[PDB]
Structures are given as structure tokens and as C-alpha cells.
């Protein structure tokens, strides 16, 4: 896999920065893959860096959703919860998701 060609529809080539910046805006249909990618990255990180990264995820989720209506935010969060369930993922700790 030293060939630079890629046509992958995933987050495996996205920078940590860019993964943080999309917090709260990733489509529900992509949420299981996003969450798997975040967990993959975090599992590798020293805890100081992991905590920093988690803070960024929260800050970006907050910024990215602050101006949404509650109706639109809840619709997304419900869909996210369901997608995560179907992907056999760990339940959100908080329904406001990554904001919190």
C-alpha cells in the first residue's frame, strides 16, 4: 500500500484536526465510521493528548451546533443514537452528544 492512489469513502486519511472540526456536523449515516475512527485515533494517544483532543471535539461540537434549532439538533441526535445502536456501538453518555 505504498501506492499513493486512494478512492476510500472513509475518515482513515483525515487529519486529527479535521476530524475534530467536523464534530457535531457528521451525517448520521457516517456516524459509526466517524466514531470508530475517533476511537482508533484515541486508543493510540497518550492520555494528555487524548484529553486535549476530547476537549477539541467538545468545543467544535458546541460551536458547530450552538445556532441550530433544538428541533433540528434533536432530530440529528436521535438519528445518531439509532445509528450507533445499529452499529452495535457503546451508547452516547449524554444525549447532547459531543457538545457535553
Ligand X SMILES: O=C(O)c1cccnc1
Interface contacts to a copy of itself, rule CB under 8 A: 65-71, 73-74, 94-96, 99-100
Report the residue numbers after which the chain has a gap, meaning the C atom sits over 2.5 angstroms from the next written residue's N, or none.
none
The answer to whether 98 contacts ligand X (rule: CB under 6 A) is yes
Binds ligand X by CB under 6 A, chosen from 35, 37, 41, 53: 35
Q: Which is nearer to ligand X, 6 or 69 (CB)?
A: 69
The answer to whether 37 contacts ligand X (rule: CB under 6 A) is no
Amino acid at each position: 500500500a505504498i501506492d499513493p492512489f486512494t478512492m476510500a469513502k472513509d475518515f482513515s486519511k483525515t487529519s486529527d484536526e479535521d476530524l475534530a472540526k467536523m464534530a457535531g456536523v457528521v451525517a448520521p449515516q457516517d456516524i459509526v465510521d466517524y466514531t470508530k475512527e475517533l476511537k482508533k485515533r484515541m486508543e493510540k494517544m497518550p492520555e494528555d493528548k487524548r484529553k486535549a483532543f476530547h476537549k477539541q471535539l467538545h468545543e467544535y461540537a458546541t460551536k458547530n451546533t450552538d445556532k441550530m434549532t433544538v428541533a433540528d439538533f434533536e432530530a440529528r441526535q436521535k438519528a445518531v443514537k439509532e445509528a450507533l445502536k445499529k452499529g452495535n456501538m457503546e451508547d452516547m453518555d449524554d444525549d447532547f452528544g459531543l457538545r457535553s
